[PDB]
Amino acid sequence: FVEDWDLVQTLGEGAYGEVQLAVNRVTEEAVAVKIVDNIKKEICILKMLNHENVIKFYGHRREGNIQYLFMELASGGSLFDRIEPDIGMPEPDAQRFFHQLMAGVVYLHGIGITHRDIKPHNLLLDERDNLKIADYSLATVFRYNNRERLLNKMCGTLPYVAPELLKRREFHAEPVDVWSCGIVLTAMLAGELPWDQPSDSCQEYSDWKEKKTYLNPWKKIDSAPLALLHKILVENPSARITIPDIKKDRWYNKPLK
Ligand SMILES: C[C@@H]1CCCN1c1c(C#N)c2c(N)ncnc2n1C
Numbered sequence: 607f608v609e610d611w612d613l614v615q616t617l618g619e620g621a622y623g624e625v626q627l628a629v630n631r632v633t634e635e636a637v638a639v640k641i642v643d644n645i646k647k648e649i650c651i652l653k654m655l656n657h658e659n660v661i662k663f664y665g666h667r668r669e670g671n672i673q674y675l676f677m678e679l680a681s682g683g684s685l686f687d688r689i690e691p692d693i694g695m696p697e698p699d700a701q702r703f704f705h706q707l708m709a710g711v712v713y714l715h716g717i718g719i720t721h722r723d724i725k726p727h728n729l730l731l732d733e734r735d736n737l738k739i740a741d742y743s744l745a746t747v748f749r750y751n752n753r754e755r756l757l758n759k760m761c762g763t764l765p766y767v768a769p770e771l772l773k774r775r776e777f778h779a780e781p782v783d784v785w786s787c788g789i790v791l792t793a794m795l796a797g798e799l800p801w802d803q804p805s806d807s808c809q810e811y812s813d814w815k816e817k818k819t820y821l822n823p824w825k826k827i828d829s830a831p832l833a834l835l836h837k838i839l840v841e842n843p844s845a846r847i848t849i850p851d852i853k854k855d856r857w858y859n860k861p862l863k
Pocket of ligand 1: 618619620625661678681683684727728730
């Protein structure tokens with residue numbers, strides 16, 4: 607369906623466009639291809655990406671209106687599909703995925719890139735269940751020539767967004783991504799999202815700020831990972847734990863099955 611590649615089946619759809627499995631008729635190599643028709647930007651960011659926990663970019667092709675973004679195939683599918691509703695997954699699997707997600711986010715932050723839509727749909731698995739951060743549709747530069755710029759665009763997915771993104775005119779990129787990593791960890795350990803959005807008017811958010819951890823999803827989570835979620839899901843982004851400090855957390859470093 608494109609040059610040497612056949613488009614076998616749909617892998618899913620994001621905001622704009624669709625992702626297909628592409629098998630090479632000759633080589634039998636299978637990749638993923640995103641079919642689109644802002645996009646100059648995504649391509650530019652995709653070409654920066656070189657890390658084991660980030661989806662690799664292979665190259666692009668415009669054929670009329672349609673753009674084709676060839677990227678690493680994650681044959682394990684999404685983290686979303688490993689989260690059992692109302693249960694989550696075994697704590698050692700969740701810890702391993704969390705370690706990989708941090709590795710990925712440190713890498714992105716280190717090249718001055720914020721993902722801005724971290725959630726289990728955008729977290730993919732290779733054939734060895736290695737986590738890959740995928741979909742650079744909303745990704746943006748927050749650091750250039752060693753100068754940070756504050757963000758102002760509201761974007762992402764409400765249950766995953768940090769509260770400052772609803773309250774502040776401008777905010778730091780990195781603590782928004784840390785927050786969404788904490789919602790992902792909650793989802794992995796409890797198989798449910800704690801609130802529709804982190805606003806004053808959201809009773810489940812108020813409950814958390816009042817430390818009612820006898821409620822779900824918190825009552826399903828062991829005390830060690832929950833102590834970490836206490837440091838991540840902190841309303842003031844300048845008091846929120848940073849990744850260097852996540853890497854010193856007792857649960858983060860706890861040996862597990
Ligand atoms: C993450 C997006 C969102 C829509 C579905 N997606 C994707 C990919 C991307 N990109 C992707 C990929 N590279 N390998 C395998 N499966 C993929 N799926 C489901």
